[PDB]
Amino acid sequence: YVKKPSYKIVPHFLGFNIPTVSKWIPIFGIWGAAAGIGALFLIEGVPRTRQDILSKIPIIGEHWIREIPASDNPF
Amino acid sequence: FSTAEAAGVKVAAQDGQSPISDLSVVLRGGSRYATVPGVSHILEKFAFQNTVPKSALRFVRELELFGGKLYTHTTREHIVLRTQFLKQDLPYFVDAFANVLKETKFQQFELTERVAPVAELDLLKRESDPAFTALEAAHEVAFRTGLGNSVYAQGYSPVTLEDVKEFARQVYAKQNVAVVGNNVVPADLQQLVGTAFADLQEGSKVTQAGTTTLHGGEARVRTSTGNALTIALPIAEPKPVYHALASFLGGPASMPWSVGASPLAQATVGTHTSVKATYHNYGDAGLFAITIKGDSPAEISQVAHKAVQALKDTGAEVTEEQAARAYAKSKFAAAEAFENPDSSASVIGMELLSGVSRIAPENVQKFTPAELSEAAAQLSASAKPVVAAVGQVHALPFADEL
């Protein structure tokens, strides 16, 4: 015979609890990647982005190593 | 159902072989005892509201964890509160009923926002059927007060929180409470009720203000939502033969797509109308009713004439075949009523709260053609016929026409 139902209250805040949030942790990850890729793509033209990030990527990085010949540069 | 007593409370239980138990508290608090019109309906709807140990919210959330269900209804005689659960969860349900009877906080906001609106939807759903209305109207004409009180709360006469609190002070007392357990081990229930309902007031037996008086008459409830007609005959001496007569006269078909072989069923041929004879025993008076619903007032009128003729014809002569058919249909009706949890609970509730021993379906008396015809004769020759017409009342019959 059962006298009482068996349960606990899980900690919660602003209507979030850890079981639920834990399911969304990976989604925040992917959105973070999406925002990272997007941001980097937006500033791909900035010379510092190329110098410090993009030209350092292996294989692919040579796409961003481009020199103007000294004969063709007024400045 | 082994009847016993636990701490002043009458407890009846029957063990079975099922995972499902039904526990019902039957209260002597139906409408015949209602202090003010509609209070017994409101009290029924106030069950499992906020108690001091446990809120209505907490109760419902925990009930869902046990997968239990809750059923409540009000009759002229009782309020029935039933729970259905798994066998093992019995202690929880006993304790829940104890909280309701001992510790209900009857709060004004519950009445205004929760209880009264639900009671109003309950009634409106019932009245969608014009036959319900007609049979209710018929009891009101026949008895006026007591059995003639409305079962349900109506808008014209409002129930107040003080009305409900006073009635509950009377009803929720050891003298007005019976516990009925279907598929509950009887020894286990007695032990639990004995601990849980020990501090319930003793109180006193609730009584009907005034003696039951019988009256004839007419009620003409003009609605726009369907047509019906009840022909009732108030009975001063309730006798078990009227069960047999109700089942004999019959009305509903025992077979799909058929009319039926019962006299009242045969009265409906050529019409889209239905009929049903019923007998209501209330201990000290009874009501024998024949209700006809349909879409056509002309057809209802036509059937109504045939129905009263059928009753007169029965008063003349019944065959042996017909008397045996009555015994069979009546034993069956008794059996299925003792099976149905809603009606079952009230049957044992009546045995426990009054002292009217239940008639087992296997002990239903066989009435001879003489006894049946004699019963029908008394009804055909009643001094106090009641007729309740619902719908296009200008087109429905009157008592003096029948």
From Swiss-Prot, chain B:
Q: SUPFAM superfamilies of this UniProt entry?
A: LuxS/MPP-like metallohydrolase (SSF63411)
Protein family (similarity comment)? Belongs to the peptidase M16 family. UQCRC2/QCR2 subfamily.
Does the UniProt entry include the keyword Transport?
yes
Cysteine pairs forming cystine bridges in this chain are: none
Q: Which PANTHER family match?
A: CYTOCHROME B-C1 COMPLEX SUBUNIT 2, MITOCHONDRIAL, METALLOPROTEASE
Membrane topology field: Peripheral membrane protein
Q: What is this protein called?
A: Cytochrome b-c1 complex subunit 2, mitochondrial
The UniProt subunit note reads as follows: Component of the ubiquinol-cytochrome c oxidoreductase (cytochrome b-c1 complex, complex III, CIII), a multisubunit enzyme composed of 3 respiratory subunits cytochrome b, cytochrome c1 and Rieske protein, 2 core protein subunits, and additional low-molecular weight protein subunits. The complex exists as an obligatory dimer and forms supercomplexes (SCs) in the inner mitochondrial membrane with cytochrome c oxidase (complex IV, CIV).
Q: What does this protein do?
A: Component of the ubiquinol-cytochrome c oxidoreductase, a multisubunit transmembrane complex that is part of the mitochondrial electron transport chain which drives oxidative phosphorylation.
The main location class comes to: mitochondrion
- Subcellular locations according to the entry: Mitochondrion inner membrane
Q: Which InterPro entries match?
A: Metalloenz_LuxS/M16, MPP/UQCRC_Complex, Pept_M16_N, Pept_M16_Zn_BS, Peptidase_M16_C
Which of UniProt's keywords are assigned here? Electron transport, Membrane, Mitochondrion, Mitochondrion inner membrane, Respiratory chain, Transit peptide, Transport
Q: Gene that codes for this?
A: QCR2
Q: Name one GO cellular component term.
A: mitochondrion
The scientific name of the source species is Yarrowia lipolytica (strain CLIB 122 / E 150)
GO molecular function per UniProt: metal ion binding; metalloendopeptidase activity; ubiquinol-cytochrome-c reductase activity
One GO term under biological process is: proteolysis
Q: Which Pfam families match?
A: Peptidase_M16, Peptidase_M16_C
